[PDB]
């Protein structure tokens, strides 16, 4: 059934100019990562080589090589968010979940994003497609509460 979805995706991006990125985006959105089982057909459709595809996949960060937990937590580690106390937040959260930075699981996945546009609302995060700001050491409780 995966092949069907993939074919659909490829058909949807037919004739476009430089359609590798969109196609990969969609492939990821579908499954959750770029399986090596799907490096070839993409190439076959686009006239590329498995290698080029894998290289593109490897370069960019937003293309998962392996799936994530049921929940995901991106936590800015940039300048501004750092300024208004991101370290402490990070510590509290990774103590709560027991998962350090970059370390994933079947349950959750904590990672970094390096900005979100919430540079005034300095301590910022993205939890499961929901943005959060002004993350003091209290809101983390609510963050974890809705998130086991």
What residue 30 binds from other proteins, ligand FES, none (CB within 5 to 8 A, per partner kind)? Answer: none
How far is Cα 122 from Cα 103, in angstroms, rounded to an integer? 23
**Burial (CB count within 10 angstroms: exposed 0-12, middle 13-18, buried 19+), residue 23:** buried
The tokens 């509290």 sit on which residue?
Answer: 92
> Does 80 help bind ligand FES (rule: CB under 6 A)?
yes
Residue 106 C-beta: closest distance to ligand FES, Å: 28
- Closest approach of Cβ 110 to other proteins, in Å? 20
CA distances from 7 to 12, 89, 111 (A): 8, 43, 31
Round to whole Å and give the CA distance between 143 and 50: 40
Which of other proteins, ligand FES, none interacts with 51 (beta carbon under 5 to 8 A by kind)? other proteins
Of the residues 36, 87, 103, 136, which one makes contact with other proteins according to CB under 8 A: 36
From 99, 110, 124, 140, residue interacting with ligand FES (rule: CB under 6 A): 124
CA-CA distance, 60 to 53, in Å (whole number)? Answer: 11
# binding residues, other proteins (CB under 8 A): 15
Is residue 39 part of the contact set for other proteins (CB under 8 A)? yes
84 vs 144, beta carbon nearer ligand FES: 84
| Interacting residue ranges for ligand FES, rule: CB under 6 A | 76, 78-81, 115-119, 124
């Amino acid at each position: 059934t995966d092949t069907a979805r993939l074919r659909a995706i490829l058909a949807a991006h037919r004739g476009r100019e430089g359609a590798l990125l969109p196609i990969l985006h969609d492939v990821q959105a579908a499954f959750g990562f770029i399986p090596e089982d799907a490096y070839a057909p993409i190439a076959a459709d686009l006239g590329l080589t498995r290698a080029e595809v894998a290289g593109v996949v490897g370069f960019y960060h937003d293309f998962r090589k392996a799936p994530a937990g049921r929940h995901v937590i991106k936590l800015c580690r940039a300048e501004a968010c750092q300024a208004m106390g991101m370290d402490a937040v990070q510590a509290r959260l990774e103590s709560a979940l027991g998962l350090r930075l970059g370390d994933s699981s079947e349950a959750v996945t904590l990672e970094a994003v390096y900005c979100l546009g919430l540079c005034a609302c300095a301590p910022a995060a993205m939890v499961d497609d929901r943005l959060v700001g002004r993350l003091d050491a209290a809101a983390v409780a609510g963050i974890v509460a809705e998130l086991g």
